[PDB]
Enzyme design. Sequence first.
Site, PDB file in Angstrom:
ATOM      1  N   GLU A   1       4.826  12.417  13.146  1.00  0.00           N
ATOM      2  CA  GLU A   1       3.757  11.547  13.621  1.00  0.00           C
ATOM      3  C   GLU A   1       4.148  10.143  14.028  1.00  0.00           C
ATOM      4  OE1 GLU A   1       0.862  12.622  14.239  1.00  0.00           O
ATOM      5  OE2 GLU A   1       0.834  14.506  13.076  1.00  0.00           O
TER       6      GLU A   1
ATOM      7  N   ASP B   1      -3.272   9.488  21.037  1.00  0.00           N
ATOM      8  CA  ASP B   1      -2.447  10.574  20.632  1.00  0.00           C
ATOM      9  C   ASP B   1      -2.103  11.449  21.825  1.00  0.00           C
ATOM     10  OD1 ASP B   1      -4.643  12.254  20.945  1.00  0.00           O
ATOM     11  OD2 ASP B   1      -4.741  12.777  18.834  1.00  0.00           O
TER      12      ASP B   1
END
Length: 163
Positions: free
Chosen positions: A11, A20
């Site tokens: 991440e 994202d």
Amino acid sequence: MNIFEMLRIDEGLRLKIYKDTEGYYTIGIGHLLTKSPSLNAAKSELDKAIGRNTNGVITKDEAEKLFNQDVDAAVRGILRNAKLKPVYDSLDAVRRAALINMVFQMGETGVAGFTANSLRMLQQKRWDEAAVNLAKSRWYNQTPNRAKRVITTFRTGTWDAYK
């Protein structure tokens, strides 16, 4: 290696609001803020999460706190899920970390959509087969390098994809 290090790897860490892979507002260590296309909506979800007027920026400690909260919730979502629990309970320690990674990433809901197949194969310990099945998914096609790491983990039961 452990679940935290693993996801910290998948991440990354950003202290400022970002989009994202799907284009949703996120911050910290993969913490989804909102699916809404509004930066203000995002900023407001962030203040609510942090308990302060952040102005779209947090500190590292704040990010780490959201992260712990988030890993815990994933674990707990799995354990409450009638379809997930049994799978999780049949796995060794490495492979569970792989299942937590998927849940953290796609939600308990997203993962539910693999149970009928890959998850069943995992439960039966057919590593090579589940790995192939797992790869036939939107998940693999959209985020192939990450998916490959997770899939290798389930396949081998080692952390090699992460070292």
